[PDB]
């Protein structure tokens, strides 16, 4: 959604790591910044984290310049040449389940207690 804003301290319903929906509590609203890059073969990634840029220290100095050549460490642990496209912060929701487990989830994966699932 929404319509409904979700706030810290609110009981909501979201999927646990076991893959089923349970009630959980929003413990914090976080901002995660994702980087978008074009790899040298022309494939596109929309969900790098700033630390995945290994040619410069983006956590310390911010994003590369638009179009800047970069090296990126991919999820296979290998390094690839790319060019920086854009960064976009996404508002997210850190939730805690009855068992103490936590997840950081996007708005669309959070439901209020009053609404029909899914």
From Swiss-Prot:
The record marks 52, 74, 80 as: Histone H3K4me3 binding. Ubiquitous. Residues 4-61, 62-118 form the Tudor domain. It comes from the Eukaryota. Ubiquitinated by RNF8 and RNF168 following DNA damage, leading to its degradation. Degradation promotes accessibility of H4K20me2 mark for DNA repair protein TP53BP1, which is then recruited. Also ubiquitinated by the SCF(FBXO22) complex; leading to proteasomal degradation. It is found in: Nucleus. Histone demethylase that specifically demethylates 'Lys-9' and 'Lys-36' residues of histone H3, thereby playing a central role in histone code. Does not demethylate histone H3 'Lys-4', H3 'Lys-27' nor H4 'Lys-20'. Demethylates trimethylated H3 'Lys-9' and H3 'Lys-36' residue, while it has no activity on mono- and dimethylated residues. Demethylation of Lys residue generates formaldehyde and succinate. Participates in transcriptional repression of ASCL2 and E2F-responsive promoters via the recruitment of histone deacetylases and NCOR1, respectively. Interacts with histone deacetylase proteins HDAC1, HDAC2 and HDAC3. Interacts with RB and NCOR1. Interacts with VRK1. Interacts with FBXO22; this interaction promotes KDM4A ubiquitination. Belongs to the JHDM3 histone demethylase family. The 2 Tudor domains recognize and bind methylated histone H3 'Lys-4' residue (H3K4me). Double Tudor domain has an interdigitated structure and the unusual fold is required for its ability to bind methylated histone tails. Trimethylated H3 'Lys-4' (H3K4me3) is bound in a cage of 3 aromatic residues, 2 of which are from the Tudor domain 2, while the binding specificity is determined by side-chain interactions involving residues from the Tudor domain 1. The Tudor domains are also able to bind trimethylated histone H3 'Lys-9' (H3K9me3), di- and trimethylated H4 'Lys-20' (H4K20me2 and H4K20me3). This is Lysine-specific demethylase 4A. The chain holds residues 897 to 1011 of 1064 of the full protein.
